[PDB]
């Protein structure tokens, strides 16, 4: 059971004088020969993808910062200095910019893999909490970063996603001014964002430290509602070399596609308007902040008192909870409820591979995510308003009511024993 196999430091004198600093003991006993089940599909790779992508972003950023100058008058020029003069330039920038896209794409699949195979269910709450914390940090990071080029979309995205904090009453304008460094956006905001943007990744790495510490102490989830049967465990092959090699193969494929993009379709995920300098006096059409924030942008700009299911007219009972504040609360709740999940699913069961109704609702949820992604880009004119309202309502409904009802009446399936599934 949970064989650590510390190696007893019996190799030789080198492995015996290393009794001063244990380090190799840690690596070997824990982070390399960690028994993992055999039943792992191709959905348990994306964590390696995320770690590599994080390293990539940190490196490329440390390189760019050697040529980026945070200032309204010299940011655009420095970015062009990069893409033209520097030796590698375009590569670093395109790899930095697009890799953010892959990062978020990979976390999406990392998260939805989790919702299916009960990875939030006990005893794996801490991992979930830490993951939501990370998600928040990395969203804030990417936001701070999209601003640095001082293009045109930078300015206005910052403007609105800071007016949010100002929507709330009493302490809105104060926070807004304390965050922007002033009444509106200017170089001060740029300096804050650069610093902050150059600091959070390390916090993320530490949090990834705790993320990795947790699911090593707590066994990796597995396609089944079963554990490694610790009591000797013919199942649960080790990590190295088997799963290391599997993950590296998938990672090679992913990097292949990523570099093909970088080299042929690099400006595809971007907004052309970010290639024109900023004008605080003129706003372009369809700001469309980005593609990894459209869901929450839509959940925000949906509630506007423009439907018979408009709960804003009812929330107006209290004269303080206006629309804006309502949408902001709705977004914060869209995330808080995803974090609260493990204490809402009242099921003494596990992976939805044995819960059909859950399968249907979950695929509807994935569809809802895609729809929200597609709607945040389209105007607030009919019919898109009804669509956004329906989708947000279903998100909240799933995460609040649907899981309890299932946990109550959702066991028409024969659960599998013997995690050694030699089929």
């Amino acid at each position: 059971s949970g064989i650590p196999h510390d190696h007893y430091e019996p190799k030789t004198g080198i492995e015996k004088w290393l009794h001063d600093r244990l380090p190799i003991v840690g690596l070997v006993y824990d982070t390399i020969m960690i028994p993992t089940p055999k039943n792992l599909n191709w959905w348990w790779i994306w964590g390696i993808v995320l770690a590599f992508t994080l390293v990539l972003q940190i490196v490329t950023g440390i390189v760019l910062a050697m040529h980026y100058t945070p200032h309204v008058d010299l940011a655009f020029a420095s970015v062009e200095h990069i893409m033209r003069d520097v030796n590698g330039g375009w590569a670093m920038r395109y790899i930095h910019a697009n890799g953010a896209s892959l990062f978020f794409l990979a976390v999406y699949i990392h998260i939805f893999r989790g919702l299916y195979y009960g990875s939030y269910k006990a005893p794996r709450e801490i991992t979930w909490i830490v993951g939501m914390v990370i998600y928040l940090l990395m969203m804030g990071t990417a936001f701070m970063g999209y601003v640095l080029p001082w293009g045109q979309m930078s300015f206005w995205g910052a403007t609105v996603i800071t007016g949010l904090f100002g929507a709330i009453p009493g302490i809105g304008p104060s926070i807004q001014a304390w965050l922007l460094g002033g009444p509106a956006v200017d170089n001060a905001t740029l300096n804050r964002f650069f610093s902050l943007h150059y600091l959070l990744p390390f916090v993320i790495a530490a949090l990834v430290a705790i993320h990795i510490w947790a699911f090593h102490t707590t066994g990796n989830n597995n396609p089944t509602g079963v554990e490694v049967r610790r009591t000797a465990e013919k199942d649960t092959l080790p990590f190295w070399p088997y799963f290391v090699i599997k993950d590296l193969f998938a990672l090679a494929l992913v990097l292949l596609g990523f570099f093909a993009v970088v080299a042929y379709m690099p400006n595809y995920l971007g907004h052309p308007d970010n290639y024109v300098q900023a004008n605080p006096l003129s706003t372009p059409a369809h700001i469309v902040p980005e593609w990894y924030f459209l869901p929450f942008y839509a959940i925000l700009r949906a509630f506007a008192a423009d439907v018979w299911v408009v709960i804003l007219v009812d929330g107006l009972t209290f004269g303080i909870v206006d629309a804006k504040f309502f949408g902001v609360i709705a977004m914060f709740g869209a995330i808080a409820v995803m974090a609260l999940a493990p204490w809402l699913d009242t099921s003494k069961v596990r992976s939805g591979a044995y819960r059909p109704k859950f399968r249907m609702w979950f695929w509807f949820l994935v569809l809802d995510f895609v729809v929200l992604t597609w709607v945040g880009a389209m105007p607030t004119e009919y019919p898109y308003d009804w669509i956004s309202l329906i989708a947000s309502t279903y998100w909240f409904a799933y995460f609040l009511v649907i899981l309890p009802l299932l946990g109550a009446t959702e066991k028409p399936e024969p659960i599998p024993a013997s995690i050694e599934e030699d089929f």
Binding site: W156, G163, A177, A323
Partner: protein
Amino acid sequence: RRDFLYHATAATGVVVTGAAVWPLINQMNASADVKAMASIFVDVSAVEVGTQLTVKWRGKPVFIRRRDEKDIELARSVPLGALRDTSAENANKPGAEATDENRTLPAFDGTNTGEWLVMLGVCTHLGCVPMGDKSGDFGGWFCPCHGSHYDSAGRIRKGPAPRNLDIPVAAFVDETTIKLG
């Protein structure tokens, strides 16, 4: 005493910690160079009354647009009913009703109001810049960030934006100038 001494040491440590932390949260506030936040003299100077005039100030645009009769009549024909914000956000006067007579502007040092209207070109939803030049579904301004329709006099309509376009404190400089601040 055990309790008193221990708890007092802890309290003093906490107080010192807070006194050290506060400035790390104070430096991010507006600095003195941002404290200035003063006025601007924009000269109307025959810009062909009726289209628009925009000028930068305080980091935000200040819209100075003449009036087109059709725009005017549409304005003056708006009863307070069915008007989201009837407060006439203009700070050059009290909270008087959001009426075009009060909402257009001072009268050149003369006596007339249905000819000029200078407001803050900042959407009250989240601070975007609406597009002018007769746009939207009300012959006024349209915000492209979320779709808020403004009217001729700038009062909010058809969107999430709660209130109309504010009007800063401004007076005239004897028939060719504007004082913003």
